Paper text:
Stimulated by the first neuraminidase (NA) crystal structures, the NAIs were designed to interact with the active site of all NA types. We identified a novel isoleucine to arginine change at position 223 (I223R) in the NA of a virus isolated from an immune suppressed child on prolonged oseltamivir and zanamivir therapy. In contrast to the frequently observed H275Y change, which causes selective resistance to oseltamivir, the I223R mutation conferred a resistance phenotype against both oseltamivir and zanamivir. Our results support this suggestion by indicating that a ligand-free form of the pandemic neuraminidase adopts an open conformation.
Consequently, binding of zanamivir to the active site of neuraminidase does not require the reorientation of the side chain of E277. In the case of the wild type neuraminidase, the glycerol moiety of zanamivir forms two hydrogen bonds with E277. This interaction is unaffected in the H275Y mutant.
Residue numbers in the entry:
A (entry chain C), B (entry chain B), C (entry chain A), D (entry chain D): 83 to 469
Write the structure that this text describes.
Amino acid sequence: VKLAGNSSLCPVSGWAIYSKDNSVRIGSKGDVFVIREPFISCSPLECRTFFLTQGALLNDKHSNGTIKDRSPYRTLMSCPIGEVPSPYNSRFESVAWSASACHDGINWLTIGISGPDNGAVAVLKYNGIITDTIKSWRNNILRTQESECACVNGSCFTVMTDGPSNGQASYKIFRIEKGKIVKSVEMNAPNYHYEECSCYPDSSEITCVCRDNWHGSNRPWVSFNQNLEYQIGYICSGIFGDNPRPNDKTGSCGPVSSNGANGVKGFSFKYGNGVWIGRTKSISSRNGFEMIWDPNGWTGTDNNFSIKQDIVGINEWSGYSGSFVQHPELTGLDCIRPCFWVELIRGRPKENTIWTSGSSISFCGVNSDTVGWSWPDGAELPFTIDK
Amino acid sequence: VKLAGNSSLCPVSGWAIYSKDNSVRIGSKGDVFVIREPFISCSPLECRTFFLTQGALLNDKHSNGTIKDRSPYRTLMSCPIGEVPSPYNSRFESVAWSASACHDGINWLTIGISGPDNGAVAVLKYNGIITDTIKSWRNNILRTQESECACVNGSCFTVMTDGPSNGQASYKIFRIEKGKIVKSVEMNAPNYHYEECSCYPDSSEITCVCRDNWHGSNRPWVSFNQNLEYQIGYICSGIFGDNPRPNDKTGSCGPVSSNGANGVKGFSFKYGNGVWIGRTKSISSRNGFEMIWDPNGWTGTDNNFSIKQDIVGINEWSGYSGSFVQHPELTGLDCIRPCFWVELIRGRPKENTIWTSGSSISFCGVNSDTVGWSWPDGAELPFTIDK
Amino acid sequence: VKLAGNSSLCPVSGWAIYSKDNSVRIGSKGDVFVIREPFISCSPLECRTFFLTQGALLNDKHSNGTIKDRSPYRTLMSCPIGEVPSPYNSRFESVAWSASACHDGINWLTIGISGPDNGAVAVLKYNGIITDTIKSWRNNILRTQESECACVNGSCFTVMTDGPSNGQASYKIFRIEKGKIVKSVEMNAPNYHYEECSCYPDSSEITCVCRDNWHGSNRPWVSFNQNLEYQIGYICSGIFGDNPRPNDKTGSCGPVSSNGANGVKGFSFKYGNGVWIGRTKSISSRNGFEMIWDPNGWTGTDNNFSIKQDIVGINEWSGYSGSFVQHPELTGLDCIRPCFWVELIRGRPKENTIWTSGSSISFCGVNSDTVGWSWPDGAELPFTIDK
Amino acid sequence: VKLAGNSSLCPVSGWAIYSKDNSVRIGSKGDVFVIREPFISCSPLECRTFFLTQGALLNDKHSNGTIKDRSPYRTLMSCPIGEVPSPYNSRFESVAWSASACHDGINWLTIGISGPDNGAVAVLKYNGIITDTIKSWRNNILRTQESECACVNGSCFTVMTDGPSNGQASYKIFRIEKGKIVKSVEMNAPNYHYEECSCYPDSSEITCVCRDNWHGSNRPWVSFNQNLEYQIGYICSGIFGDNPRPNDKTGSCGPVSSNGANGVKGFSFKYGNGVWIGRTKSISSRNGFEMIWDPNGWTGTDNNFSIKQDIVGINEWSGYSGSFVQHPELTGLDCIRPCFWVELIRGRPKENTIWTSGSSISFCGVNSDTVGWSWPDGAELPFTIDK
Ligand SMILES: CC(=O)N[C@H]1[C@H]([C@H](O)[C@H](O)CO)OC(C(=O)O)=C[C@@H]1NC(=N)N
Ligand SMILES: CC(=O)N[C@H]1[C@H]([C@H](O)[C@H](O)CO)OC(C(=O)O)=C[C@@H]1NC(=N)N
Ligand SMILES: CC(=O)N[C@H]1[C@H]([C@H](O)[C@H](O)CO)OC(C(=O)O)=C[C@@H]1NC(=N)N
Ligand SMILES: CC(=O)N[C@H]1[C@H]([C@H](O)[C@H](O)CO)OC(C(=O)O)=C[C@@H]1NC(=N)N
Ligand SMILES: *[C@@H]1O[C@H](CO)[C@@H](O)[C@H](O)[C@H]1NC(C)=O
Ligand SMILES: *[C@@H]1O[C@H](CO)[C@@H](O)[C@H](O)[C@H]1NC(C)=O
Ligand SMILES: *[C@@H]1O[C@H](CO)[C@@H](O)[C@H](O)[C@H]1NC(C)=O
Ligand SMILES: *[C@@H]1O[C@H](CO)[C@@H](O)[C@H](O)[C@H]1NC(C)=O
Ligand SMILES: *[C@@H]1O[C@H](CO)[C@@H](O)[C@H](O)[C@H]1NC(C)=O
Ligand SMILES: *[C@@H]1O[C@H](CO)[C@@H](O)[C@H](O)[C@H]1NC(C)=O
Ligand SMILES: *[C@@H]1O[C@H](CO)[C@@H](O)[C@H](O)[C@H]1NC(C)=O
Ligand SMILES: *[C@@H]1O[C@H](CO)[C@@H](O)[C@H](O)[C@H]1NC(C)=O
Ligand SMILES: [Ca+2]
Ligand SMILES: [Ca+2]
Ligand SMILES: [Ca+2]
Ligand SMILES: [Ca+2]
Ligand SMILES: [Ca+2]
């Protein structure tokens, strides 16, 4: 039965651990896909991990040069949450080097993007049957969330970007029903840069927090209702949420240009003026991960904050992070539950290997007791294939 | 419920990618089967890849000599589409060095041929229970589709061949109900040659686009109704569909004698006088893949066409291709949906290995935007076991 | 719903091939159990392979010594017919160095004998739950069918043997209901020897063909009814069933003493005074396999016969062989369908390895065309673990 | 339906072997989790083995140092009884270096503890959804059963411990409904020590037999009803159940201090004044396992017993052990069947390897015959990774 999507977000005081797959540790001996850009999505029955394979296994030669982002071998697959991504336990979803997925309560919708950099095509599938396509309109790397899309009342919403990664690009919001694109809209957003949006449903409204690769080290947000009427802004908190970023100082309601180029995929959950900010501990590279509660972070520009929970220690490897939710239909609760995941990138460029891959951890928001710790990857690199 | 088969083949403008298994790249380290002759068939609930294994895993010594077509070791097996053929995720079907399979909407029918070239016998299983057999009637390598068979309203149809591959052979058309051969017609087709027929339902009638190993570098076709009343012909288009073949020029409505000896198994979708042709990019070897829409190719003999979509690059290994459909029962559509797959042959006789295996890719037709690319095998040869 | 057991054996002219797993070949790389004593039994829904693992993998140090018949590491496991027996696809049944299994149409019954040679205990499970045991009554290797028990009207029947192999031992029949033993009878068989019976239902009565390891080169048989009233004898046919055996001569209704010591597990199907005989092709060793129809060979001492179908050629390894049946409730037929499996033993003591394991092929009785051939194991010995 | 747990515990005279996984043997070559602390729990439909992985595989470098008790890499996982703990056959439960699990008849409840030693948080999942948490209240290694919690009429019960391992600590009992902690009680147990309780239901009440790591060589117990009203004491039998322990002699209803320090997880079944004691055969180290019937052991301090049964030999490594039950809803009996499992520890600290892992065996109480034997782990150490 379809997901109502009309409840508010559970107010949550801390983050309890939900999963860890240990993929790279196990992959040293096991048959584990080289993957990256992993994410989690839940259905009214199960929660799955979705990932982009590199069409190759760990500690094998075809993991050579897998730092590369796009190829015709990359595919989106999924497995149950907490299990290593394996040829022997993973469902095939689509051929993709950029992807999103979610479940309307009835069926899985997956969006996979493959093809040339200047002509990429997005394949929408509803219950594994192709239902639509969307072709690149700016002819410069069509790309999407690498996180769950968001479903409200039988409709599913996503953001896509085409254009430069180092200047003004174009951003469309899609509304999908049964894998059919039924409405789209181009955000008129001069000086904003949106990428890899982390989008969640909250009171029949979608909110997305994204990646400014052009010139923002804080995150841009876009929010919109079912009719794709949208609002936009930047998270005003001087506790910056991108990577790279400056040391915390007074923030902006626009893109903080200082250390704003490049970035990483991230998320934040909005509660009124308050915001839960997921972020790396290191300001210069993908190490560490922490969760911060700033009661005025969404719209205030100061950097004072209340709560910090540690998730990955400063000296340990992190990467992408995304939001995922559990709906009352699955949870039984009166509200939609905030969760987040963290990719733990290993290999190139930071380590001396011929390959890049990641594992994952995940957390769900609660009001009961919670603890900070460090849950890093744990693999001893380099592996045998590097010698 | 059983598949109606009564609707018309969906009009398609371009092909969107559906699956890529990366079977060979992953076979480097993983436990994957040496396979060839893969193909895809759907039930109303799921789509599956079928394949003949060589009863052997990749990068093991038992892949030695796997260029050989027939042995008592080959078994027909299947796994969910897009996944790698591994003995951990594969379902056993039959013992076979030539096969066919299809689902009538109720249960899977499979046909596996094994035994000596002198008098091989086909075994028919319905829900995995032997339900009929048929023995060679010319004592010269009884062989069938290596493709999905077609089903319309409870009856399933396939095409078998017995006899020379380099001259006149015998051709039988079968009607199969619940696993039992209930009718067969011997085809009166002197100077026609049919092997490895790709067959699909289209308005309660079946169309087969097959291979002429004898003396045609265009493709033989046979249409028939439920009572196995048939019409035979050849694809008239000057965009010759076989491999090997001559350069494109004036077509013929009989077999195109030039470079007609030998062949690859292939497919085509008929649309009035038009034809959607899928073929190799090279005219001399199993390399490259492309779809061509010839608006008059079924009946006309020019080599003119209106659309070309690139599937596999010219310089990269391809091989077999075959048709498959997705019925309204599976899709919700009011038409039978045309799809296809391409086997990607690796190793012998073209490459310096001790083995021959294949990976697969597949596409389904749409009217929405699409793009041509190259989605090749990707593995680096030779492997550890060749060295 | 219960297996009826009330219908007759299907008359069958020949044997169509049904499964081939390629276990030892695949085991050269893939993670495959070293097993032996495999056998097939079918529920009214699926057919499974039961095997006795040695609790080790192929090509690993622990396969060392696997010629050993008994140990505390041997477990009875289960996998889908034709698939390779591995930790990744097999189901745990019982701890066992001698076993039996059969489905009554409601649930699986399993019988797993383990423990010391001088006081073994058979554990009976019904639907995975233990439901009875029985202690050795002769304190010399309590041992049983190594092949499917036969079921009629909700009761399941088996034969077990306890005592010496070099002479006269003791033999009991059992009627098991819901995994409870409800009746047991000791066969009064002075000068008969019974081991590893292949038992099949047929017109509500059980017929077992067994193994004389003591002094009989033709095969002993017990027939009984639902009340365990029984008749015994030997297969009269001059076509000697057991191996080792003499060359074919005139036979006897009692134990043929010429080459009567030792033996191999085997099977045969009775049809009136006729008999279908499955046996090795060699008279000295476990090589070859062939099926033979002697229309009077059940009661007639003549060495004539009218059908010989090749299964495994004389120069190839074979070994154990048993009967398995398929009931109407699974096939929709109007009778009980005979089928058999052959185990293909590789390694010690005939081949220079540190291990003994085996693969399996199976056939089912049909009335349409069949051919004979050779379907051997086909692995190249010795393995890496032997070098 | 939800388990009643109102029947009494089925009285038994011996223990028949139920399952053996052969983990470390299979792990030599195959992809098997480095684990420890395994336990069995059962739903009304199936039986599963839970285990605490070390986020690594046997015979891989990542198993290095796996003698450490707690780490971020440790996760609670489960698989079907008797299958090896594999990335390919095993399910993710939660992240845990301490755990319990049980099934109320409707859904699996899991508890996983992770975090710092001074801050560990127990996360509770019901059907894989986080439903509660409980944090360390004494800041000293929060820990739980390492076996199945017991279930009664929709409520599940567990015991937890926080505090010193070598002195007075804090013990608490919990009532869990659908994953919600509904009631908890702190035991007033001065001069007692509780850890790793084995808890079973018996006539709508809960009996836990535990471990005194402080100063007790016999095991403590705590019985309680659904309302969390409890009585406490120590197993009075002079046949001591802990390890290390001193020589069997006269017992005590309080802490027997000789060798009292330290211990090993165990179990025992109460039968009026009678006790079924499971214990290692060595008094100094985890070697061997035996079952012993002391008809007055619960309340009488003499060291006489009626039955002893050999499980694992003295010259073989044992390890942990615990109870598990098979409710009438699963077996069909009218009592709650007692069953136990034994962890067979291999590697450090007792052997020359870099790793530690455990295999397992299980037994079920019967009334029919059994046999004493020795089903030891059977692996040949060291492995290649230790060389
Ligand atoms: C489509 C694509 O390649 N997206 C990139 C992403 C991208 O380059 C930046 O956002 C710039 O626009 O960089 C990130 C990254 O790790 O920084 C990897 C992504 N990899 C893939 N999704 N495969
Ligand atoms: C039964 C059989 O061996 N069919 C052959 C096929 C055939 O020989 C030609 O069509 C000539 O008749 O050639 C093709 C081929 O790749 O050319 C491989 C097929 N291999 C398998 N189907 N196994
Ligand atoms: C219980 C037992 O050990 N059965 C033996 C069997 C036996 O030796 C003969 O029947 C003689 O008594 O021979 C066969 C055999 O290979 O000849 C192996 C069996 N091995 C196993 N089933 N484990
Ligand atoms: C939570 C924890 O660390 N538990 C320890 C346990 C513990 O040290 C003792 O009970 C005393 O406090 O000892 C046992 C043990 O081997 O004796 C291993 C346990 N390993 C795991 N549970 N992970
Ligand atoms: C939300 O959706 C439910 C289910 O359709 C509906 O009954 C209810 O009216 C809505 N309640 C709110 C405002 O959350
Ligand atoms: C990876 O690639 C480079 C060239 O692209 C090559 O030099 C190197 O040997 C490769 N590594 C492996 C192990 O294949
Ligand atoms: C949900 O879906 C239907 C689709 O027609 C729509 O009409 C209705 O307004 C929606 N109800 C809500 C917002 O709960
Ligand atoms: C064939 O197609 C028509 C139109 O879709 C449908 O109404 C009819 O039920 C089908 N016929 C049969 C016999 O199933
Ligand atoms: C395969 O067999 C060939 C002979 O055809 C032999 O030359 C080669 O060494 C073999 N390769 C392997 C690794 O088995
Ligand atoms: C097998 O057994 C023998 C005798 O114990 C031993 O010496 C040999 O090395 C073993 N082979 C293995 C374990 O590879
Ligand atoms: C256990 O509970 C069930 C349901 O209330 C009941 O039918 C049964 O008799 C009970 N047994 C007792 C009370 O011992
Ligand atoms: C395990 O631990 C020690 C210390 O890290 C190291 O010296 C040793 O080489 C390791 N062993 C392996 C094979 O990883
Ligand atoms: Ca940035
Ligand atoms: Ca040709
Ligand atoms: Ca004999
Ligand atoms: Ca005769
Ligand atoms: Ca103690």
